[PDB]
């Protein structure tokens, strides 16, 4: 629902 700082270590995009 809100955007985080993703950074290099997150598979936040499924």
């Amino acid at each position, epitope marked *: 629902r809100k955007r*985080i*700082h993703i950074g290099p270590g997150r598979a936040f995009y499924t």
Partner: antibody, heavy 122, light 108 residues
Framework: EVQLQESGPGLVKPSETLSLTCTVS????????WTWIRQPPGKGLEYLGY???????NYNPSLKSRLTITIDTSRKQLSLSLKFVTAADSAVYYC????????????????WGQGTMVAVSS | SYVLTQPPSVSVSPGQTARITCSAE??????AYWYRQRPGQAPLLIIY???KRPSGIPERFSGSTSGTTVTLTISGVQAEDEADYYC??????????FGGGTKVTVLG
């Protein structure tokens, strides 16, 4: 179980470079943004930056030009380098873990070291 | 660039509910995070992503979000809750910002 231990010189002269080290134990060096945060006596917290295990960094925009953070994955240690210090840099410097993995807490610092006191003085 | 605005002090009596607000235009599309810091101590994460509690944190600590304002609510406040409470956020670019902190004082 992740524990963080900061080490520093205690005292740095104005205009010199501050060097600190944080040692990580009780957990993996992967899946975390290893973070430096500071707090001047009687004042609030201020973000400094992170390093990821691959060496990727992220800095507070206001301090980027003076700040370098590095990681040694083999020793499970990260280091802070802050150039040209003044009295404004006198603070307790904390090492903290931002967990970065499926199921994490987002952009939060869930474990902190006890901090290391740095005085900038002649 | 953004700044997180929280009151420097909140006073409550024992058994009452303390409410600490943190506000910024940035908070409309950014998560907030709450920390408790006791004197001479490292901060403790109490709320993440606006409303979520870590495992060790009891239900008496609740986070809420409303537009550009987040609120930390502490119910059943006692003397042991006296501490500094910090709000924190991050934007997409990796600009992490802390609020100035709120000192909770328990009266009486």
């Amino acid at each position: 179980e992740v524990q963080l231990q900061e080490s520093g010189p205690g005292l740095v002269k104005p205009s010199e470079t501050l060097s600190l080290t944080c040692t990580v134990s009780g957990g993996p060096i992967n899946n975390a943004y290893w973070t430096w945060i500071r707090q001047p006596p009687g004042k609030g917290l201020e973000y400094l930056g992170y390093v990821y295990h691959t060496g990727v960094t992220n800095y507070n925009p206001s301090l980027k030009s003076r700040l370098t953070i590095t990681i040694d994955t083999s020793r499970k240690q990260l280091s802070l380098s802050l150039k040209f210090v003044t009295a404004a840099d006198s603070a307790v410097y904390y090492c903290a873990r931002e967990w970065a993995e499926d199921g994490d807490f987002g952009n939060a610092f869930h474990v902190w070291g006890q901090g290391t006191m740095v005085a900038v003085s002649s | 660039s953004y700044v997180l605005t929280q009151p420097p002090s909140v006073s409550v009596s024992p058994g009452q509910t303390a409410r600490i607000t943190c506000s910024a235009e940035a908070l409309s599309n950014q998560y907030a995070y709450w920390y408790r810091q006791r004197p001479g101590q490292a901060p403790l994460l109490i709320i993440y992503k606006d409303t979520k509690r870590p495992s060790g944190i009891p239900e008496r600590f609740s986070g809420s979000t409303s537009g550009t304002t987040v609120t930390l609510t502490i119910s059943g406040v006692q003397a042991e809750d006296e501490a500094d409470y910090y709000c924190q956020s991050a934007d997409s670019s990796g600009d992490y910002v802390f609020g100035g902190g709120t000192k909770v004082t328990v009266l009486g």
